[PDB]
Design goal:
part of a larger assembly; 2 chains; A: mainly alpha; elongated; B: 52 residues; mainly alpha; 23% helix; rod-shaped; motor protein; OAD; axonemal; pre-paralle
């Protein structure tokens, strides 16, 4: 959950730069998919 | 082609400034000007009253 949370913060940093260039956030949409799988582990950790 | 246009408009290729002018607040006032009061005076003069 911590390793996924570290990758999720770097994702926010990348998204802030994607909006500057306009560029359609497709690489962000694939990371959000990895972050969603992380958030599912984060819910299993919030239960633990 | 629609995304590419949205992709063409940047933050460093279309800044978005706000500008207003300083407007004084409107205000409604009354001013009544009445001239000095005007008093009637009655004087008589005769040769004796002058001399007296």
């Amino acid at each position: 959950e911590d390793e996924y949370d570290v990758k999720y913060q770097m994702y926010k940093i990348n998204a802030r730069g994607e909006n500057l260039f306009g560029l359609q956030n497709q690489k962000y949409p694939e990371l959000e998919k990895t972050d969603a799988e992380i958030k599912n582990l984060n819910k299993l950790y919030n239960l633990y | 082609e629609e995304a590419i246009k949205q992709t063409l408009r940047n933050k460093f290729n279309y800044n978005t400034r706000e500008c207003q002018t300083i407007n004084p607040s409107i205000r409604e006032r009354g001013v009544s000007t009445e001239p000095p009061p005007s008093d009637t005076i009655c004087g008589n003069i005769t040769q004796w009253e002058i001399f007296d």
